[PDB]
Amino acid sequence: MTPASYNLAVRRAAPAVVNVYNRGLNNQLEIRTLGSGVIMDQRGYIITNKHVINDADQIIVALQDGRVFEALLVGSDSLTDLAVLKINATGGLPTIPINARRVPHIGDVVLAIGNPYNLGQTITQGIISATGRIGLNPTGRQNFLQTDASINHGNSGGALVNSLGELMGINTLSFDKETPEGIGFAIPFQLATKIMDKLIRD
Amino acid sequence: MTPASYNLAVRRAAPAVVNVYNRLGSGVIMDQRGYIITNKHVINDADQIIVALQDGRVFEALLVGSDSLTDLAVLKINATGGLPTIPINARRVPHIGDVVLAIGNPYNLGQTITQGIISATGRIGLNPTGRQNFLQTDASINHGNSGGALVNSLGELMGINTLSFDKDGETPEGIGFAIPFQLATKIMDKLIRDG
Amino acid sequence: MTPASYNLAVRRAAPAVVNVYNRLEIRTLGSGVIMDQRGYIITNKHVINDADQIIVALQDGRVFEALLVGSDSLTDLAVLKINATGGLPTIPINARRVPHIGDVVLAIGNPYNLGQTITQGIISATGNFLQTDASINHGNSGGALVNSLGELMGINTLSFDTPEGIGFAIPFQLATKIMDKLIRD
Lengths: 202, 195, 185
Known about the structure:
Keywords: serine protease, catalytic triad, Hydrolase, Periplasm
Number of helices of chain A: 2
Strand content of chain A: 35-45%
Order of helices and strands of chain A: HEEEEEEEEEEEEEH
PDB class: hydrolase
Largest sheet of chain A: 7 strands, antiparallel
Oligomer: homotrimer
Distance between the termini of chain A: 54 Å
Assembly: trimeric
Chains A, B, C: Protease degS
Entry title: Crystal structure of the PDZ deletion mutant of DegS
CATH class of the largest domain in chain A: Mainly Beta
């Protein structure tokens, strides 16, 4: 027989999730913070976390296949805390699966993909805990997704995908206010997307 | 292709799980008449107990009685409309390993669903739990989940979530407990036919 | 209908996972996995390190004193021996199966002495150390990490020093190799 697995999602998305690093002058340069990013398309556009690349002397993007790029910050967005990078790839880029017709449902099994404590790309699984909106009017457009898929420093900017490897959101920061568990957030993919397209227009 | 999901169990059980506050734990609308279960410590020495359903309705609830030997309490609300109730299959045998979902109101963030499995069904002899019939789960439990529901992939009530374990040396992960539904169904009827 | 479950995995593997005590009193605790019927159990070295007496307890209630037969500094794995008055349950092993990231996996050990507990996660990474998010806590060391078929994927070790859902395991291949090396003596 075959083991229960969410390996089909891991194979379709893991390759498009890169390791992001923020290096700054101390000569002598070092890593201020590190996060993750999702290669959106073969033009070299990546979506990451704004707090991960803020005040960066050098932005280093590292794919899973060994390739290391020096990236360019195209622009970030405050309301959602997203930032968009750009790399110059010539050998072909692995991209994240996207299904624009899909609508995320509470309970859907979801996988978080990121670089917790720089231990190297890790995959954690949970479900979509809730979906809401932060801002004026609770009935407004969905702003965030909540998941219990373990999130840690280094996951910021990463991808939230369902069991078909489809993009559901861009992991953000976790929750902290005793010592909470299984509470993490992401920006819906339909929103992450619309912002990128905007930003890619300067 | 269809995405793997537990949304079914959710649509079935979440409507029946309420937000408890006073003038903030959680609760489960056991049956039509308006009987709501919760933990006795959730409502202990509280003033006006307020109960908010996921459909936005809000009611005042009266403590129809709690039970110290199980840390459970039963509340009553007089609703005019129809009420949502938690699915309950009395012929179901909870097994260790069954996928389970915890529904509650963590840090008053709004109703959330967390998934884990049934870690244990009970315990033999002295133990950190202090009890024998506790259902142990690794589905994320936080302050506010107390009193909420523990359901399986069909939305059936497995137990009533209880106080979080946040320890004697370091912060534990994936350790939560729930009171068996079979025990809550007993304690409900008793506190009911007892006034 | 029937609830989605990983009980099959529990039934197959859990009987073989034991609770290891380091005594005297209790200086520390962990878990172990019965590699074969005669009573050979694998656990981690740090759990039974410097023990006046090694107590092993089966999930069925029986309690046996253990003999530290040997260990391996390299992988931090130790081997214990107990004499059961009959054949003992063994952890399922399938040397032909290749662990994949994303594979559902269960953690079986004795967290905070609560008693045997099963937590679930997935293989988060395979980069000779396996990484999983199946909740691991103090007392889980030396325990079993199995997939949905009860097959052994690894011996859980010590967690990540607050980080959430980061735990590692020593590949079952290594445990198998280390068990044969010590039984042969």
